[PDB]
Amino acid sequence: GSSGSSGSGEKPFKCKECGKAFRQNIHLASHLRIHTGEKPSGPSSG
Ligand SMILES: [Zn+2]
């Protein structure tokens, strides 16, 4: 950790997985879902 900080963001809700910011608790909760599912290939032919 050598670099500092320049543009972080000012949001009450933040993702503890990637670092996305939101304004409403619903936006974050609805986002954290996108993370769900840890598989290289789903039921779709892909
Ligand atoms: Zn995220």
UniProtKB/Swiss-Prot annotation:
UniProt-annotated location(s): Nucleus
Coiled coil, from the record: none
Sequence intervals crossing the membrane: none
Zinc finger region(s), C2H2-type: 13-35
Family to which this protein belongs: Belongs to the krueppel C2H2-type zinc-finger protein family.
Highest taxon, organism lineage: Eukaryota
Lineage: Eukaryota, Metazoa, Chordata, Craniata, Vertebrata
Protein role: May be involved in transcriptional regulation. May have a role in embryonic development.
Protein name, entry field: Zinc finger protein 28 homolog
